[PDB]
Amino acid sequence: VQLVESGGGLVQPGGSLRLSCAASGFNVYSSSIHWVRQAPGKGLEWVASISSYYGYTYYADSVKGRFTISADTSKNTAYLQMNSLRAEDTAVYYCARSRQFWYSGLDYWGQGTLVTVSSASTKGPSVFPLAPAALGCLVKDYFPEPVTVSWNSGALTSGVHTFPAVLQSSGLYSLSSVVTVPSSCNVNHKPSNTKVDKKVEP
Amino acid sequence: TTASSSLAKD
Amino acid sequence: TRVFKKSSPNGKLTVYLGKRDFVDHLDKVDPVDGVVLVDPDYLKDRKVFVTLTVAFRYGREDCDVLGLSFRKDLFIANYQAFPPTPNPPRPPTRLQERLLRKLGQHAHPFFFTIPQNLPSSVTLQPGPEDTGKALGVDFEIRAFVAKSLEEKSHKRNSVRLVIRKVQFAPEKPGPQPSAETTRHFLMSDRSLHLEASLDKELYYHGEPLNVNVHVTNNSTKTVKKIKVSVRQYADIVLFSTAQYKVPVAQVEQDDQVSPSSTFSKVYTITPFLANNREKRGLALDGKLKHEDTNLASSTIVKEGANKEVLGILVSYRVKVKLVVSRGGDVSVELPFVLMHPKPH
Amino acid sequence: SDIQMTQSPSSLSASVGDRVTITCRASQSVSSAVAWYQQKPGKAPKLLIYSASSLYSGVPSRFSGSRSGTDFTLTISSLQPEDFATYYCQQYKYVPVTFGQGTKVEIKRTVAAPSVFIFPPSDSQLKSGTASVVCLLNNFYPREAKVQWKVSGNSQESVTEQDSKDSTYSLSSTLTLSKADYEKH
Numbered sequence: 159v160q161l162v163e164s165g166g167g168l169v170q171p172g173g174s175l176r177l178s179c180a181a182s183g184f185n186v187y188s189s190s191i192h193w194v195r196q197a198p199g200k201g202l203e204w205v206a207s208i209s210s211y212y213g214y215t216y217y218a219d220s221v222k223g224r225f226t227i228s229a230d231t232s233k234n235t236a237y238l239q240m241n242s243l244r245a246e247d248t249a250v251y252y253c254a255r256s257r258q259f260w261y262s263g264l265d266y267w268g269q270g271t272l273v274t275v276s277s278a279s280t281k282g283p284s285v286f287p288l289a290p291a292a293l294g295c296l297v298k299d300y301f302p303e304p305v306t307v308s309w310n311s312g313a314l315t316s317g318v319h320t321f322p323a324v325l326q327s328s329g330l331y332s333l334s335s336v337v338t339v340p341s342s343c344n345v346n347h348k349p350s351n352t353k354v355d356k357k358v359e360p
Numbered sequence: 361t362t363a364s365s366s367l368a369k370d
Numbered sequence: 371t372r373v374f375k376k377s378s379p380n381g382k383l384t385v386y387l388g389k390r391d392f393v394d395h396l397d398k399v400d401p402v403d404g405v406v407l408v409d410p411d412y413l414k415d416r417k418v419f420v421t422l423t424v425a426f427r428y429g430r431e432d433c434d435v436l437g438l439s440f441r442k443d444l445f446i447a448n449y450q451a452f453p454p455t456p457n458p459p460r461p462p463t464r465l466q467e468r469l470l471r472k473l474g475q476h477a478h479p480f481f482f483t484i485p486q487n488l489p490s491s492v493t494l495q496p497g498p499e500d501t502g503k504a505l506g507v508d509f510e511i512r513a514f515v516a517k518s519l520e521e522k523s524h525k526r527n528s529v530r531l532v533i534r535k536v537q538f539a540p541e542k543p544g545p546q547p548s549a550e551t552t553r554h555f556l557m558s559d560r561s562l563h564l565e566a567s568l569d570k571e572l573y574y575h576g577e578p579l580n581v582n583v584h585v586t587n588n589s590t591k592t593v594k595k596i597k598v599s600v601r602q603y604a605d606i607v608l609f610s611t612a613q614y615k616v617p618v619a620q621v622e623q624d625d626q627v628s629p630s631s632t633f634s635k636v637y638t639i640t641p642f643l644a645n646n647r648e649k650r651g652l653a654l655d656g657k658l659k660h661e662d663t664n665l666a667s668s669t670i671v672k673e674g675a676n677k678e679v680l681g682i683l684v685s686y687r688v689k690v691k692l693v694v695s696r697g698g699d700v701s702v703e704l705p706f707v708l709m710h711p712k713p714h
Numbered sequence: 715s716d717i718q719m720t721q722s723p724s725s726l727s728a729s730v731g732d733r734v735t736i737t738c739r740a741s742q743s744v745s746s747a748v749a750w751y752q753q754k755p756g757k758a759p760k761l762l763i764y765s766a767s768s769l770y771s772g773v774p775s776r777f778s779g780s781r782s783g784t785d786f787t788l789t790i791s792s793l794q795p796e797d798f799a800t801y802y803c804q805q806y807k808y809v810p811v812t813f814g815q816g817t818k819v820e821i822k823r824t825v826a827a828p829s830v831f832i833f834p835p836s837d838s839q840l841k842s843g844t845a846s847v848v849c850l851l852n853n854f855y856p857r858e859a860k861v862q863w864k865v866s867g868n869s870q871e872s873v874t875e876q877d878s879k880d881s882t883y884s885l886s887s888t889l890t891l892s893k894a895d896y897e898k899h
Contacts, residue, residue, distance in 0.1 A: 187640050188576030194813070201802065201815040202759070211576050212662060213644030218810055219716075231640075252758065258576055259664065259710065261806060263749045263764035270758050288833035288848050296836070296848060319852060319884045321872040326890075334872065334886050336831070336850055358836075362531070364372045364745060365386070368472055370464075372745065 159183030159266065163253055166271035168302070173275075174241050179253030179268055181234045187211045190256045191229065191236045192264065195249040202252075208236060211258050221247070240273075248275045274302075278329045282350045285343070287358030292317075294336030295343035295358070300350070301330050307345035309337045311355070373469065380526040382412040385420075385513045386477075388465040390658075392484070392535050396672055402482040402533070405469040406451050406513055409476060413515050418452035420480045420513040424488065426608060426681070430503035442608060444507065444680055445488060448519065451478040459483070484535065489681025490669045491534040491656025498648055507681045508656060509533045534656045537669060538712050544571040553700045560589040565634075566690060566702045573708050575664045576642060583690055584634035585627050591698060593627035597691035598637050601703075604653050604666075605683035614651050618665065627692075641665055641686070641708060653684050667709035717742055717812050721803050725818040727856070731792040736817050738786040738803035747807035750779060750788050754799045755875065763788065795821070823881040828854035835896075845896040849887035857883050865899040 165177040179191070190209050196202035207216050208227045215227050227238040236253070253268040281301040288294035297305060309318060317338030323331045335343070344355045377384040387404040394400070408418060426442040449455075459481050462470065466479045493506030514528040547568045554561040563586040573579060579600075587593060599620035606612040619641050627633045643665055646652055653666035666684040686708050691701040720739045728734050738748070750763035761770050763779040766786065776794070780787035786803065798821055803814035831850035839845065849871075851859060863869060871887035 185577050187578070187642050188574060201813055202753075203813055204811045211642050211644060211664075213647070216809055259574075261747070263761045263770070263806075264751075265761055265770070267758040267760065286836040286839040286842075286846070288836065290833075292831055292850070292852075294831075294833055294848060294850070296833075296839075296846065298846070319874065319877075319886075321874055321884075321886045324870055324872055326870060332888075334848065334888070336852075336886070338852075361376075363375050365375050366472065367371055367373045368468060370468055370471075 161253060161255065161266050161268040163251070163268045163271045166251075166273055168274045168276065169240075169243055170277060171243055171245055171275050173243055174239065175243070175273065176237065176239045177251065177271070177273075179236055181236070181255065184255065184266075186229065186231055186234050188258050190258050190261075192254045192256060193238070193251060194254065195247075195251050197249045200249075206238060208238075209258070243275050245275055248273055276329065278302075280350050281330055282352035283345055283347045283354050285345060285354045285356040287356055288336070289358035290360050291340040291342075292336050292338045293342070293358055294334060295345070295356070296332075296334050297345060297354075298332040299328065299330040300332070300347060302349050303331065304349075305333060305345055305347050307333070307335050307343055309343045310357075311344040373465075376529055376531045378526060378529045380412075383408050383513070383515060383527070383529060385511075385529055385531065386469055387511065387531060387533075390533060392533060393538055394484075394486070394535070396540070396670070397486070399484045399486065399535070401463075402484060402511070403463050403466055403479075404511070405466055405473070405477040405479055407473060407476055408452065408478065408515065416515050416517050417450060418478060418513070418515045419519065420449055420451055420482075420511065422447050422482050422484075422509065422511050424507065424509050424681075426505065427508055428505035432502075434502040436501060439505070445485070447482065449480050449482065451480045451513070452515075454478070486672065487676065487678055487680065488535070489683070490667070491536055492666050492669075492682040492684060493654050493656050495650065495652040495654050497650030499650070503660070504650075506656070509535055532658060534658070536655070536667060537709065539572060539707075539709060540670070541712065547571045547704050547706055549702050549704050551700055551702050553698065555589070555591075555698070558590065562587055562589045562591070562692075562694070562698070562700070564692065564700075564702065566704060568688075568704065568706060571706050573706065574711060575708065576640065578638045578640045579688070579706075580636045580638055581688060581690065582634075582636055584632070585692070586632050587627045588630055588632075590629050592629055592695040593625075593633075593692055594695055595622065595693035596625055596627075597622055597693065597701075598639060598688075599691070600639060600641055600686065600688045602653065602666075603685045603687060604651075605679065605685070607679040607681065607683070611679070616649065616651050618646055618649075618652065639688070653682070665708070668707040670707060670709075717744075717805060717808050719803055719805065719812055719814050721814045721817060723817070724815065725820075727820050727822040728793055729822050730795050732790075734790045734793055734819065736788045736801055736819075738788070738814065740784045740786075740805060743784055744805045744807060746781070747805055748781070748786055749804050749806065751802040751804065751813075752797075752799055753802060759802065793819075820876055821881055823855060826853055826855040826880075826882050828852060828859070828885075840893070843893060845891055845893055847889035847891075847896075849889065851883075851885035851887070853877075853880060853882045853884065855882050857885075859885060861887060863889055 160182050163179045169175050192207040194202050194204045205218050206227050208229050210229045224242045229236045250272045252270045254264040255266040256264050278301050283297045283300040286296040288296050320335040323333035325331050346353045375386050384407040392400050423446045424444040428439040462479045470477050489507050494504045496504035511531045549566045552563045565584040567582040569580050599617050602618050604614045621639050655663045655667050687705050689701050689703045718741050746766045748766040751759050752762050753759035766781050776791040778789050800816045828851040833848035835845040869889045873885040
């Protein structure tokens with residue numbers, strides 16, 4: 159028994175997208191499909207559910223009408239179409255299974271995929287050195303995630319602390335990392351295909 | 361209406 | 371854990387029932403046990419009784435303006451809760467003792483034994499053309515306080531509560547369900563031999579069924595279409611045997627079996643309610659008030675065949691029909707059960 | 715209608731083999747349709763308790779749950795060192811279901827003082843026209859801290875997960891202003 163998803167990416171607000179979760183190892187009619195979303199750093203909350211056996215559908219109040227849900231018994235797959243996307247709807251999405259007779263929790267959870275909604279475009283990293291003990295590397299105004307930043311192509315991994323990237327109002331993400339060298343960095347951005355290497359000297 | 365009470369554990 | 375409760379409208383009479391669902395083991399059904407709470411000065415001359423009536427109720431109870439139930443009483447029993455009777459049968463039980471400890475002296479134990487020759491909770495599906503609820507055997511526990519058994523019913527006195535009697539699958543699987551059919555012609559020596567076999571004889575709701583069908587068309591006629599369907603049979607007995615059969619799920623494939631050829635296949639068919647919301651006469655498992663449910667759970671009969679026909683009996687069958695050119699249509703039928711597994 | 719939950723505490727810390735109790739409260743009465751869910755950081759959640767008292771299959775017996783009216787008790791007997799994560803509460807006999815706000819559980823250690831590092835904007839950053847002040851707080855315990863600015867608003871702070879090597883915290887805060895605004899001080 160397994161559960162898989164596909165369809166994540168970035169969507170222009172006011173646009174639309176469609177997500178799928180394929181079911182294997184169990185039976186669609188003797189089960190139910192529910193989806194729940196989790197905003198970054200927030201508590202996961204329920205969005206929609208389809209009951210194929212009863213032929214019923216349900217939606218959350220915040221997303222009533224905007225969203226649809228469908229199921230295909232031939233391919234053991236569920237389909238739902240997202241419309242009138244807004245900036246607050248971005249989160250990580252999961253597909254879940256539950257015993258139809260009877261509801262007894264959500265025993266199986268998919269690997270999960272994320273949905274991002276924004277107008278930001280691709281932006282390469284900009285290395286701003288942080289020299290004076292310790293020394294740090296600052297990357298600002300980049301898009302999108304992720305960025306693999308190491309010191310001297312990962313020559314030394316001791317004393318390096320890499321912090322999660324955050325979003326400021328400019329619409330571009332930024333992260334930081336500092337290496338502790340009291341006595342005495344290679345960063346690659348795969349989505350932007352940009353590699354920026356720089357070093358800071360006191 | 362149909363409801364529930366307490367019940368103890370012996 | 372918890373205990374369900376129901377109270378009289380007056381608030382002076384309240385009944386506590388240990389469980390809302392009851393199960394049978396094909397030889398003994400779990401007894402119905404409960405306690406009743408009452409303050410003596412409210413009656414001060416009367417007596418307390420509880421009744422388990424099983425009725426062939428039709429329609430609903432929400433004061434609907436229509437021809438109401440044919441209220442045949444299938445089986446009714448009585449027990450004097452208060453004043454206290456002899457200790458049997460036989461003790462106050464562990465749940466009864468625990469409720470007495472919780473409450474004290476104002477509780478009164480009552481006991482009941484459900485005879486093994488009684489039906490299972492079944493309810494016919496109400497048709498959209500008609501109005502309100504539909505008929506179906508159902509259980510009910512009614513506790514009332516009065517001086518006499520035949521004393522007139524009072525709403526403030528009587529308290530009404532609904533219970534269900536459902537069955538659970540035995541852990542021992544049965545024999546493999548299979549069938550065969552060899553159909554010759556009117557005179558010619560050519561014949562038509564077909565085979566049907568099943569995965570199992572027991573299945574769970576929603577779980578697909580894969581019928582193993584094989585055809586040996588060593589004949590001269592041609593097979594036009596193959597029809598695959600699952601039939602439901604509802605043996606209704608009130609005072610005369612009745613049988614309302616109705617299909618629930620049918621699947622078709624435009625496959626042609628040529629003369630002097632062999633053809634085998636497996637088909638996936640699932641009994642489910644989503645596509646049969648409107649078919650009147652479909653049988654659904656007993657509801658609590660009005661909530662939805664699955665299809666009617668197949669009711670296994672006890673080993674000793676006796677009669678057991680005092681209510682609604684439901685069974686399932688699957689038939690595969692072979693459309694043979696210019697006559698000679700032949701179909702194969704086979705039984706199987708479909709009902710819940712053993713919970714924990 | 716909307717049946718909101720109210721769990722507490724939002725966060726707590728413990729150690730190996732401790733008795734940890736987390737409580738879930740419901741704004742209305744729910745009979746038994748209450749479940750307990752654990753989610754490791756960055757990965758899919760997984761059920762631990764369903765029907766408010768049953769322990770799901772493939773789960774060590776050390777977990778346990780209890781009910782008291784509208785209050786729910788979730789206890790761990792001997793907390794294994796790989797269980798440090800967040801926990802979630804849900805009720806599921808009314809549509810729609812509702813979930814908790816997350817409850818962090820982490821290992822405890824001694825209190826460690828931090829080493830404050832402030833980094834000036836780079837020369838290329840100086841020529842870029844935007845200036846940022848990098849504030850560093852490394853190897854400190856616990857996570858909470860108080861940092862002031864005076865040389866204010868327009869500041870963002872980042873903190874990482876407990877470094878298991880030293881069981882401590884590292885925090886980074888950034889103060890970004892313009893060159894004219896930076897130089898007026």
